[PDB]
Subunit: 118 residues, 6 copies
């Protein structure tokens, strides 16, 4: 049987949805306190007792983090439609290359509402 | 690989357990601040960038919601034994017909205790 | 210096004096949070105003009266609003916990009430 | 006796008067929490200081002005810090809710601000 | 399709990591407010409407609980390297024998960081 | 107007002056929450009482003394109750943050302590 590990970051940005019908609240400029969850799966080095470091995880994420934190998302190439579904994937795509063990990504824009890409 | 989405509602009702041994706290009339989590899986329309709406999800749930919120659960046909296990299913059963993408239902009666039916 | 301790208990209530078919008038329930908070000086030796276990015991009677119960049944709780209810709690505990200074009650996660003094 | 009600709304803002390329000066956003809290006596009959639904309605105008909006656009919110912002809210509501006694605003989960009186 | 159930406990202990490079914050004596989640899967007795009791679950866990709560973890045989990965497993191992339905164990040492063994 | 900022740090402690084999006397630990809160007037131009980053820096020394450490080792923290501990923190920070008005410490999620003034 298997072990997975998981780490939460939060960040602050503004976004808007380009393709919502004209009235929709969601297409007005607005913002959120997003939460992101990286999750990794793999083996547990018998010496460190770790799937992986974390210092190493943080710093691998960080440049991707910094691009979103306290920023407007539609200006980031890839996120012209900054939906949770689109964003969760956008992350997977940036970090999967530098974190091979990336198992799944989760994005919550509100307390009460989220998204999990694999 | 695949994307799932998820939405939290909370509601207020009273319930009691019909079949607990005579002393049990749980068979006295009492109530809870329940939390319910609908989760859907499916594809991400390339134009909307959405698995589905939400306004559309909310309103599809709503009649089922309204029947539980600020109500006593044993009076609802189906919930004569308003356990989490029984309730989580009871929901699946009402909403799966109107939300084909329903992937799983979660019911938490306390902060610290829940149930996930699929 | 003030301390404060928090408890959830799980119960039912309806409000009797509410309009027509208003939804708080239908027998419902909530997961409630109660916060006793107390003010005194720390013992220069224990480093404590009270245990937190001295507290627990002194509450426990009132606590099991409410947890997993229906509130309207409880003399003094005909009409169990947050306001009635926090006050009622204060009346029960102030005798057994003289240092006690506030009682806070929350029905839901987002509403709540403080009965000070 | 005090009551308090809590609301999240979801919005964008940037701070105009901040150094160089400081990160709060880049157009960002937050999930905000607002807490109105009010002080009065309970009706000896309703058991209430106010509904919580009387409240909701009296706020609702100001609330939809902020939710899902950009704040700098809102006259009086050029410079939307927590401090500016809680005060601004107080100025809008104190007229419509005279019992109102504090306004608390939180940008993030861990920072926040109370504008009393 | 299937029902799983889940229960949260929290506990207080101190631990340190034996095998971190010399500076690391993590190898200094420190402690945490850990959270543990037992999760069970099985069938729902049609009379009780329960996968299982809980009173029965609690008390089956309890001796294992008591050994960790308000204790230093490196002194417990098995936990000489009290990492989340190692600890989550350590639990599985103690409770799986007395709770056959144990489906998965979760350990969170901070609000923002955890581990799920199966 | 008051602001408040929140920090978790992760540490160990035991209480020396506690009965027999009482469980707080066994070397344990907690995830602690510290809340500095401060009261002053907002700058009519910045819209701020303080940064939140001016704060962070002024705390940081005391903060890394506690985070990931054992508390009984720290002069003045023989006997690290919440009460001792919040006060101790106040004594360290009030010099570096004169506007500071409360310090709140929480051992667990449900207990806690405020050292005002
Ligand atoms: Zn949005
Ligand atoms: Zn129940
Ligand atoms: Zn109610
Ligand atoms: Zn900001
Ligand atoms: Zn640690
Ligand atoms: Zn302790």
């Amino acid at each position: 049987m298997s072990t997975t590990l998981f780490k939460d970051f939060t960040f602050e940005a503004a976004h808007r949805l380009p393709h919502v019908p004209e009235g929709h609240k969601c297409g007005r400029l607005h913002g959120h306190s997003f939460m992101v969850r990286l999750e990794i799966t793999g083996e547990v080095d018998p010496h460190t007792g770790w799937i992986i470091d974390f210092a190493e995880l943080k710093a691998a994420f960080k440049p991707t983090y910094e691009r979103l934190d306290h920023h407007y998302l539609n200006d980031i190439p890839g996120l012209e439609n900054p939906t949770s579904e689109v964003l969760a994937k956008w992350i997977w795509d940036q970090v999967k290359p530098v974190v091979p063990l990336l198992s799944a990504v989760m994005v919550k824009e509100t307390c009460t509402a989220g998204c999990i890409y694999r």
